[PDB]
């Protein structure tokens, strides 16, 4: 509204391998231009 721009999101996965598999499977298949990532509330480095 400030100035043709879709958006998609998905929650964090417990398994890093499963998270990466979900990432591309869903995010990549949609042909995104950037991915926003944030740390979960759990204290995992």
């Amino acid at each position: 509204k400030r100035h043709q721009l879709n958006a998609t999101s998905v929650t964090h996965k417990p398994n890093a391998i499963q998270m990466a598999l979900s990432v591309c499977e869903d995010l990549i298949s949609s042909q995104v231009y950037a991915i926003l990532v944030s740390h979960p509330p759990t204290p995992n480095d």
Binding site: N15, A16, I17, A20
Partner: protein
């Protein structure tokens, strides 16, 4: 592991796999042979590069 592509990031992926699967991985050729700066301490990924 041995690949023919020149994509560097593939090597990075292998290290990540070694971090989670706890299986030793050896780079041979192509992207895998590319040496990364610092691997994760849990990862057991090795390369033949310099």
């Amino acid at each position: 592991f041995g690949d023919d592509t020149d994509q560097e990031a593939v090597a990075q992926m292998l290290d990540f796999i070694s971090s989670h699967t706890f299986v030793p991985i050896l780079g041979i050729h192509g992207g895998a042979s590319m040496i990364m700066a610092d691997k994760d301490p849990t990862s057991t990924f090795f390369q033949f590069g310099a």
